Design a protein around this ligand. Structure first.
Ligand SMILES: CCCCCCCCCCCCCCCCCC(=O)OC[C@H](COP(=O)([O-])OCC(O)COP(=O)([O-])OC[C@@H](COC(=O)CCCCCCCCCCCCCCCCC)OC(=O)CCCCCCCCCCCCCCCCC)OC(=O)CCCCCCCCCCCCCCCCC
Ligand SMILES: CCCCCCCCCCCCCCCCCC(=O)OC[C@H](COP(=O)([O-])OCC(O)COP(=O)([O-])OC[C@@H](COC(=O)CCCCCCCCCCCCCCCCC)OC(=O)CCCCCCCCCCCCCCCCC)OC(=O)CCCCCCCCCCCCCCCCC
Ligand SMILES: CCCCCCCCCCCCCCCCCC(=O)OC[C@H](COP(=O)([O-])OCC(O)COP(=O)([O-])OC[C@@H](COC(=O)CCCCCCCCCCCCCCCCC)OC(=O)CCCCCCCCCCCCCCCCC)OC(=O)CCCCCCCCCCCCCCCCC
Ligand SMILES: CCCCCCCCCCCCCCCCCC(=O)OC[C@H](COP(=O)(O)OCCN)OC(=O)CCCCCCCCCCCCCCCCC
Ligand SMILES: CCCCCCCCCCCCCCCCCC(=O)OC[C@H](COP(=O)(O)OCCN)OC(=O)CCCCCCCCCCCCCCCCC
Ligand SMILES: Nc1ncnc2c1ncn2[C@@H]1O[C@H](COP(=O)(O)OP(=O)(O)OP(=O)(O)O)[C@@H](O)[C@H]1O
Lengths: 19, 140, 100, 120, 56, 320, 49, 459, 345
């Protein structure tokens, strides 16, 4: 029901030194 | 020498096939040497002999690609008797990409290289026919 | 486990307002939104625009073309001419090549 | 390219030869669009600094609008001058070198033979 | 209250004002495009008396 | 003029503001050791300013209305619950610890801004230098994990070096039994169930890292509870100090200028506390965060900037 | 008093208000008189039209 | 045209300067009034198309699309009130502004005399659409959907821009009145063939084709109801309008450069209509039906015969209306159970008796039930193709069969059967969504009554 | 840093390019370049960290080599034809080595490997300067000798810059490197058209500058240096998401934004000279450029990444930034295409 918003698993993919 | 690489267009396709093969192989070797230089300067190797290995590898691969391209192109110009057809050059680029795959051991690279090099070579033939300009002079 | 609010519980919108129309939780807003929608959609648009269109005359020159076709068939049957020539343009207006 | 034309004054905004052009109306759509840019700039400034919009810094918004319309008017006079000089140069060169810009002497469709490409 | 009656309900002039303004601009365009008024091989007619224009 | 290069040039330089008592002091100690009253007396006598200990609602008592807020805004952290259930599977422990570190950082920034601006000294009850104490106390007691400690130390080595340490430290040592008895004499129901091992860990951290680390750059005065009383005694020991060790001597007007431009920018202070390290103990989630932020903005004096809320008595908004 | 930390922009800075209003009206006046003078110069540079 | 566009602009200040409670009513009512104002374009009492300026115009082809675009805005606003009810005022206003900007840009695109304005706006219709999808969609595939939707379109459009600039440098103007009287046979050559490809593939990706159609179902599935409506109804018609306008300057290369695309369309029609059988997601079913329908438009436009253009225009209008309607219907049940699967709710005729008549009538318009205009288009397209080659009716007919099949399957397994007794949350139907279905349907009746309006330039 | 030192250094930075612009002699253009690259360094190394020191080294060595090459070119054009400024009767080798060195300085591909690093190692207000104010004087030189530049070399350089900028910024998490690669690509555009029309490269430069300056301002607002950091704007400064998204979509080259105007009016002027292939490839890869701007828009505005328990404080506090120029430039960088005729000529 709720609008899905990004979780830690999603944010951690932008968290490295390279994409 | 540029007269050499221009000897490719002194006679139409389906002629001096061996000369076209040699010219395209030399061009492939040129491009492979450039790439190997850029790949040894950047991302260097653990050993000078390994760098020379990489050089020879890339160069022989590029040369084989150019060889197959030119050869198949002139052969198709010789068989079906349609020298002014970009489809022969498409076939040639496709054989070159199939080579590129054989060397890399990847059917995906084979398909992608085919469908890309064929397009590129067909457009090159179209540009030589319809008189396009790649690096034109400013005229306005 | 990181902090978030729990997924809420669905609500019966008719629970508190049984005379609910679907627009807003505040009744007055609900009723007036309903009334404005109905008015401006059915009473105004679907009626007056429908009439405006039904009373557009000679839409794309349809009645005029019929009247003139009648005029022309009449004139041409009364004056011996045929009803349609196989050539739109008088050849005198046309100069074909001097092919040799 | 026009920089090296005769009479080019270096770093001159309005060379006084542009005073023969019809100046722009002040209600020109371009000027009253620059005005909207100024108003929206005031709005976004109030938004970023967390201020009430449409009700804060009315002097700031007026200043934005005036400055935008001012720069607009003058920059626009300049651009008009430039396009006019371009047309001037073009027509002059055409008059000077007519043999390179001859007439069309176009025929009518009675003499032309256009092919017919059916749809079947 | 009169202010709270107009702080809202005053927004009911924007869209109609926009319609009027658009009609005005269309008239301005029509005015600009008057280079063939009564100068068309079809509809080119002699002018009636007291008829200063075929159309604005 | 809001401080800047221009005001600094025209004047408002720091070195001329200072006097014999323009000093930063942090009277540290264990729980219920007697820091607040001693700080108050020192402030009064030396003419310094007193900064009460920084808790959960400092950033509120120092902003806007200056009143407390609802806890969903001020950290969602509770000390009472920390003592009730320390090993909670919700993360209140490190949430509280980091919120408190950030509050003490904000407090130290405000204190320096005051000192440099006006030249008046300030007295603190703790500091960002004596906040790893409770953290290590927790970790030694399995209240938190090592990842939280690494997060804490990262934010520490990001924020702390940019600030000048204090001039004097005043540690009032009290045995763990004495404090474990005072905590019961105080009668706070939640504080009474604190374990003596937690307090011993605090004391050990102090003795082993803090004091020997701060005795290289600031004068440490270690007192027992009988010297802690008669606060004129500590004042007398302060008035006759020789500040000859620390970074406050290799300073100048421009270093002070830059440090002041920093500490007067609270957002640039707290920047490194919000770094996107996604700990499940402080990561808040978009729905929760947005609900909280929208409510906070619906708060009377917080919808707009200060001076632009007519809802609280601001008038000339159409003229700013 | 509602804000413990007395705000900036609590009571206006009047120098900026005055300067802004003056600049605005001066720019409008300059612009209008300049447009009129430009119209006149154009007209008299070609047959008053 | 300004009298239709400037009100659509002032709608924005009306949206923002309005009290949070009266923001929906005002905008909805004035959008209805603007849809009304747009009905003057039908005052065409001659064969001389309406030119209002050097930039804005409206032919019999653009007028229906403009009226549909002006009429869909209030319906989208209404459909978008049950969701957004728990969102903040500013978010609601932003949604409404996105929709209004879409309306405005589309009216411009359809009113444009020049192809560069058409292109700029054709591309500007990506920003609000992408925002709507990725910001108010519900699942995580929002983002991949928006990416596909952006980049299919852009990779197709760039060559179009290059070709338009080439035509400019060669002819002097990209005006559509001038490029129609001042035309020349295109010498058959690989250069002009690549020009054809550049001019066409952007629209073909936007119709879409069969080979390139994966961006559409991802979007519709992951798009909120309003985005789905506008997309299906208008943002596909955009490509057909572009092709119809630009195919005059590509003659006669369209005679032999079409076989690939006619063929792909005729076959993908069957493929997609068959997919619509083994499809668990109702929205995906609607999307694949849309693809099956637009294949006919592509083929018709490719053969470029009068009957063909006429059927294509009728099918565009009718499909837009009925697809918007079907998406509204699906979202109705979605708002109750919050699932897009067509197997969960399969007895809804025992609770929503009236809403089922909307399902019935739509699925009848989805298939070709006469005298619907969904049928006249299909019929005249079939006739044009039969004239083209008498072997097209085979595929046309099997598509017809599959169409009836999956529409009946939809309504049966959704409404008919045994009710799902665990669905205690099946609130009765809202007056608002009922008005929505009524507003989608009645115009179909009225058009069926007066089809002369949606024929096109050919008739 | 004291105000006297700041005055001298910033005045020198400003003066450098002015001399280059306002000078007829090439030698004084060279000394202007040198003023620029001598004064910019202390502003890089001010932070005094290893990253700053190595950024300074990589910048200094590269710029010094390029300056020596330009000086060789000037000295050869002096030995020949006995004048200082170039002329039609000048060796193409001289002209092309000059162009290569000017590219080296600007940071065009394949002379770009130093710009992303040098921009990642320094603060943001200097990256702004580096990428906007230091790319002019070289472009001044190139615009004074545009009739003499070889079109083959600049076009190869341009397609290379486009491809490498796209492919490089495609997989960057740090924002400064994204801006570096954006600079590389937009400079490739600037250069692809210079011999045909240099009144358009100046336009593209102005637009790229007014586009990147407010982006850098946004980053400096919360000292944001990663994707995950800007993801937190919805909690810290949500009033900036609109302008951010619009400026990004413009930088990418989307209508109806004025970042599309340079792309469009350059493709046009190129096909007026029959450069179909170059413009085609350039556009198709500017699409890829747009891709990661779009991914970034996702991360920042069109969805809401997780936040922290401490940003509540930043919400409590007030903010004096940004200034008036951010809004001005961000509006004149997205909503000005309607005035394109005024912008183009
Ligand atoms: C209504 C529309 C309003 C829209 C406003 C802009 C909207 C916002 C977006 C703007 C972004 C795009 C900007 C593009 C642009 O400005 O034109 C590029 C423009 C294109 O160059 P150009 O076509 O070759 O013309 C310059 C001449 O070559 C150089 O020779 P020149 O004789 O033409 O002299 C240059 C001219 C100045 O005119 C300009 O060059 C541009 C306007 C500068 C205003 C000065 C402030 O005159 C002056 O220098 C003024 C004299 C006073 C001292 C200088 C100040 O760049 C420049 O001209 C820079 C030259 C140095 C200027 C100093
Ligand atoms: C075509 C030929 C002509 C050329 C074409 C034009 C080319 C385009 C232009 C180039 C665009 C790049 C220009 C970058 C400007 C430098 C940016 C910068 O350093 O400030 C960063 C600044 C952010 O720093 P901030 O937060 O304002 O710092 C305030 C201080 O904290 C406030 O505290 P503070 O007192 O320490 O402030 C430091 C002080 C700095 O004082 C000085 O630097 C002394 C300078 C005196 C020299 C004489 O600044 C002042 O406020 C001066 C008061 C004395 O951002 C900008 O202002 C960007 C503006 C960029 C201009 C774009 C205009 C394009 C149209
Ligand atoms: C399109 C690009 C949109 C990117 C998506 C950005 C986004 O996610 O929205 C923020 C969203 C954050 O949601 P939120 O936390 O509820 O917003 C509160 C923020 O403080 C931000 O909102 P606020 O509460 O701080 O600002 C209050 C303001 C609300 O204004 C805003 O803050 C947002 C305005 C954004 C511009 C939207 C206009 C779109 C025009 C399309 C054409 O209320 C007003 O007084 C409205 C005055 C008009 C503002 C300018 C609107 C455009 C003017 C159009 C002409 C009409 C006036 C003449 O995420
Ligand atoms: C196998 C097929 C062999 C034929 C190769 C022909 C390619 C010629 C094009 C120029 C060389 C580009 C080479 C390249 O793609 O990058 C390789 C290099 C990394 O090196 P490495 O990882 O060891 O090699 C990977 C190869 N699989 O990474 C790089 O070199 C990146 C930098 C390349 C910059 C090239 C700029 C050329 C500009 C041309 C105008 C002068
Ligand atoms: C075009 C774009 C479509 C997009 C969606 C449209 C949205 C806006 C909807 C606004 C409503 C307007 C709908 C337009 C169709 C209405 C046309 C109409 O009803 O009037 C004409 C009709 C038939 O008469 P007529 O057209 O003159 O046929 C002559 C042909 N020889 O005359 C009648 O039948 C009148 C009889 C009235 C009885 C009521 C029921 C029938 C109507
Ligand atoms: N970093 C921290 N982590 C956890 N709790 C803390 C921290 N800092 C302070 N506290 C809490 O503050 C309380 C100590 O208050 P205290 O009684 O010391 O007040 P005070 O003003 O210092 O007066 P006194 O010094 O006389 O005790 C303890 O309950 C302790 O848990």
């Amino acid at each position: 029901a709720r609008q899905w918003q990004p979780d830690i698993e999603w944010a951690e993919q932008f968290s490295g030194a390279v994409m | 020498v540029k007269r050499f690489f221009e000897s490719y267009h002194e006679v139409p396709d389906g002629t001096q096939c061996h000369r076209k093969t040699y010219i395209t192989t030399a061009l492939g070797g040129i491009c492979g040497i450039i790439g190997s230089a850029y790949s040894v300067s950047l991302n260097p190797a653990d050993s000078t002999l390994e760098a020379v290995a990489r050089v020879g590898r890339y160069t022989f691969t590029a040369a084989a690609i150019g060889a197959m391209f030119g050869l198949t192109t002139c052969v198709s110009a010789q068989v079906r008797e349609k020298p002014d057809d970009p489809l022969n050059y498409f076939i040639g680029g496709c054989a070159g990409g199939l080579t590129l795959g054989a060397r890399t051991h990847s059917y995906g690279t084979a398909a992608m290289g085919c469908v890309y090099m064929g397009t590129a070579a067909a457009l090159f033939k179209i540009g030589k026919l319809e008189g396009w300009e790649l690096f034109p002079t400013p005229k306005v | 486990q990181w902090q978030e609010d729990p997924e809420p519980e669905d609500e019966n919108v008719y629970a508190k307002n049984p005379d609910f129309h679907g627009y807003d939780s505040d009744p007055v807003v609900d009723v007036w939104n309903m009334r404005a929608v109905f008015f401006f959609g059915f009473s105004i648009v679907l009626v007056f625009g429908t009439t405006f269109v039904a009373y557009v005359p000679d839409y794309r020159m349809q009645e005029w073309a019929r009247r003139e076709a009648e005029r022309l068939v009449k004139y041409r049957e009364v004056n011996g001419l045929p009803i349609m020539e196989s050539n739109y343009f008088d050849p005198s207006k046309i100069q074909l090549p001097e092919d040799d | 390219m026009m920089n090296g034309r005769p009479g080019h004054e270096p770093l001159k905004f309005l060379p006084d030869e542009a005073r023969s052009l019809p100046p722009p109306k002040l209600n020109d759509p371009r000027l009253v669009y620059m005005g909207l840019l100024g108003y929206c700039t005031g709005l976004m400034d109030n938004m970023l600094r967390m201020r009430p919009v449409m009700r804060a810094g009315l002097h700031r918004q007026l200043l934005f609008v005036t400055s935008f319309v001012f720069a607009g008017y003058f920059y626009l006079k300049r651009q008009n001058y430039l396009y006019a000089v371009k047309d001037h140069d073009m027509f002059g060169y055409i008059k000077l070198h007519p043999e390179d810009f001859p007439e069309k002497e176009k025929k009518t469709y009675a003499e032309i033979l256009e092919p017919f490409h059916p749809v079947r | 209250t009169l202010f709270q009656l107009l702080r809202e309900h005053w927004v009911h002039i924007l869209v109609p004002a926009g319609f009027v303004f658009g009609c005005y601009l269309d008239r301005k365009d029509d005015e600009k495009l008057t280079a063939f008024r009564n100068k068309s091989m079809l509809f080119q007619r002699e002018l009636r008396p007291n008829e200063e224009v075929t159309w604005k | 003029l809001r401080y800047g290069l221009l005001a600094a040039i025209l004047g408002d330089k720091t070195t001329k503001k200072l006097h014999e008592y323009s000093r930063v002091i942090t009277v540290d100690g264990n729980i219920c050791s007697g820091k607040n009253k001693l700080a108050k007396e020192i402030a009064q006598q030396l003419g310094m300013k007193h900064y009460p200990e920084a808790g959960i609602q400092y950033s509120s008592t120092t902003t806007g209305d200056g009143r407390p807020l609802d806890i969903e805004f001020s950290g969602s952290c509770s000390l009472e619950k920390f003592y009730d259930d320390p090993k909670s599977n919700d993360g209140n422990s490190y949430r509280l610890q980091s919120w408190l570190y950030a509050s003490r950082l904000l407090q130290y920034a405000d204190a320096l801004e005051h000192l440099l601006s006006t030249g008046q000294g300030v007295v603190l009850e703790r500091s960002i230098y004596s906040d790893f104490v409770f953290l290590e106390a927790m970790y030694n007691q399995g209240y938190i994990r090592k990842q939280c400690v690494d997060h804490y130390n990262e934010i520490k080595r990001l924020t702390l070096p940019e600030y000048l340490p204090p001039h004097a430290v005043i540690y009032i040592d009290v045995p763990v039994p004495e404090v474990q008895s005072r905590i019961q004499k105080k009668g706070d129901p939640h504080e009474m169930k604190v374990t003596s091992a937690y307090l011993q860990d605090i004391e050990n951290a102090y003795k082993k890292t803090f004091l020997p680390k701060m005795s290289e750059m600031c004068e440490v005065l270690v007192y027992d509870s009988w010297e802690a009383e008669d606060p004129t005694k500590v004042v007398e020991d302060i008035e006759y100090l020789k500040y000859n060790k620390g970074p406050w001597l290799k300073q100048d007007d421009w270093t002070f200028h830059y440090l002041r431009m920093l500490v007067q920018d609270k957002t640039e202070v707290l920047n490194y506390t919000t770094i996107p390290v996604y700990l499940p103990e402080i990561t808040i989630g978009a729905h929760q965060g947005s609900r909280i932020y929208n409510s906070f903005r619906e708060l009377p004096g917080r919808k707009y900037a200060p001076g632009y809320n007519a809802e609280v008595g601001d008038k000339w908004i159409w003229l700013k | 008093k509602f804000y413990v930390r007395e705000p900036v922009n609590a009571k206006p800075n009047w120098l900026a208000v005055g300067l802004s209003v003056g600049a605005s009206v001066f720019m409008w006046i300059y612009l209008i008189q300049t447009h009129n003078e430009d119209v006149l110069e154009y007209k008299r540079r070609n047959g008053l039209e | 045209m300004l009298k239709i566009i400037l009100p659509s602009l002032m709608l924005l200040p009306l949206t923002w300067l309005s009290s949070p409670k009266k923001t929906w009513t005002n905008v909805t009512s004035y959008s209805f009034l603007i849809s009304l104002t747009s009905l003057t374009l039908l005052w065409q009492t001659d064969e001389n198309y309406k030119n209002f300026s050097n930039m804005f115009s409206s032919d019999p082809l653009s007028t229906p699309l403009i009226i549909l675009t002006a009429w869909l805005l209030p319906l989208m606003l209404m459909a978008s009130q049950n969701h957004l009810k728990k969102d903040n005022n500013v978010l609601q206003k932003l949604y409404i502004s996105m929709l209004i900007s879409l309306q405005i840009l589309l009216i411009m695109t359809f009113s444009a005399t020049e192809l560069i304005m058409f292109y700029i706006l054709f591309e500007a219709t990506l920003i609000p659409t992408l925002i709507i999808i990725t910001r108010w969609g519900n699942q995580t595939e929002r983002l991949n959907a928006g990416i596909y939707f952006l980049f299919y379109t852009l990779i197709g459009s760039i060559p179009l821009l290059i070709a338009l600039i080439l035509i400019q440098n060669h002819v002097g103007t990209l005006n559509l009145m001038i490029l129609s009287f001042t035309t020349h046979t295109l010498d058959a050559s690989w250069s002009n063939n690549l020009l054809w490809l550049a001019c066409m593939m952007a629209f073909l990706i936007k119709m879409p084709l069969y080979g390139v159609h994966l961006w559409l179902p991802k979007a519709h599935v992951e798009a909120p109801i309003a985005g789905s409506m506008i997309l299906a109804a208008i943002l596909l018609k955009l490509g057909s309008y572009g092709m119809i306008r630009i195919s005059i300057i590509l003659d006669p290369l369209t005679k032999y450069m079409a076989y690939p695309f006619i063929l792909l369309s005729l076959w993908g029609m069957i493929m997609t209509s068959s997919i619509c059988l083994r499809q668990t997601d109702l929205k995906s079913l609607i999307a694949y039906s849309s693809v099956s329908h637009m294949a006919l438009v592509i083929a018709s436009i490719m053969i470029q015969t009068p009957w063909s253009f006429m059927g294509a225009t009728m099918l565009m209008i009718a499909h837009g209306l009925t697809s918007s309607l079907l998406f509204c219907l699906a979202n109705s049940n979605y708002e109750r159970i919050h699932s897009r699967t067509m197997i969960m709710a399969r007895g809804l005729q025992m609770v929503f008796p009236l809403m089922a008549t909307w399902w019935l009538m739509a699925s009848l318009a989805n298939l070709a039930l006469p005298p619907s205009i969904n049928l006249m288009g299909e019929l005249f397209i079939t006739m044009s193709l039969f004239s083209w080659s008498n072997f097209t009716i085979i595929l046309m007919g099997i598509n017809i069969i599959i169409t009836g099949m999956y529409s009946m399957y939809m309504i049966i397994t959704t409404q008919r059967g045994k009710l799902t007794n665990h669905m205690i949350n099946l609130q009765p139907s809202h007056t608002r969504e009922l008005t929505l279905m009524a507003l989608h349907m009645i115009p179909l009746i009225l058009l069926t009554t007066s089809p002369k309006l949606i024929t096109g330039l050919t008739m | 840093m004291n105000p006297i030192t700041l005055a001298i250094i910033y005045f020198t930075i400003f003066l450098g390019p002015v001399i280059t612009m306002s000078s007829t002699n090439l030698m004084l253009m060279w000394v202007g370049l040198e003023f620029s690259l001598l004064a910019i360094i202390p502003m890089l190394i001010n932070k005094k960290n290893p990253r700053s020191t190595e950024a300074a080294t990589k910048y200094f060595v590269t710029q010094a080599t390029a300056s020596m090459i330009i000086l060789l070119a000037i000295v050869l054009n002096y030995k020949q034809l006995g004048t200082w400024m170039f002329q039609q009767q000048t060796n193409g080798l001289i002209l092309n080595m000059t162009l290569m060195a000017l590219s080296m300085k600007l940071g065009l591909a394949p002379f770009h490997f130093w710009l992303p690093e040098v921009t990642q190692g320094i603060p943001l207000h200097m990256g702004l300067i580096l990428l906007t104010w230091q790319k002019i004087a070289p472009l001044s030189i190139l615009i004074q000798i545009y009739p003499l530049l070889n079109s083959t070399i600049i076009l190869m350089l341009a397609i290379t810059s486009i491809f490498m900028g796209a492919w490089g910024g495609l997989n960057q998490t740090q924002m400064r490197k994204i801006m570096a690669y954006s600079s590389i690509a937009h400079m490739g555009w600037m250069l692809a058209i210079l011999p045909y029309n240099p009144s358009l490269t100046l336009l593209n430069l102005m637009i790229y500058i007014i586009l990147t300056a407010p982006m850098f301002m946004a980053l400096m607002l919360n000292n944001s240096m990663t994707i995950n950091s800007i993801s937190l704007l919805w909690n810290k400064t949500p009033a900036m998401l609109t302008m951010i998204s619009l400026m990004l979509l413009s930088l990418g080259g989307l209508p109806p934004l004025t970042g599309f105007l340079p792309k469009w009016i350059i493709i046009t002027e190129l096909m007026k000279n029959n450069c179909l292939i170059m413009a085609t490839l350039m556009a198709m890869m500017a699409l890829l450029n747009l891709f990661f701007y779009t991914r970034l828009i996702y991360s920042t505005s069109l969805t809401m990444f997780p936040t922290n328990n401490n940003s509540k404080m930043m919400t409590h506090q007030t903010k004096t930034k940004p200034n008036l120029m951010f809004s001005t430039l961000a509006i004149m960088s997205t909503m000005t295409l309607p005035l394109a005729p005024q912008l183009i000529t």
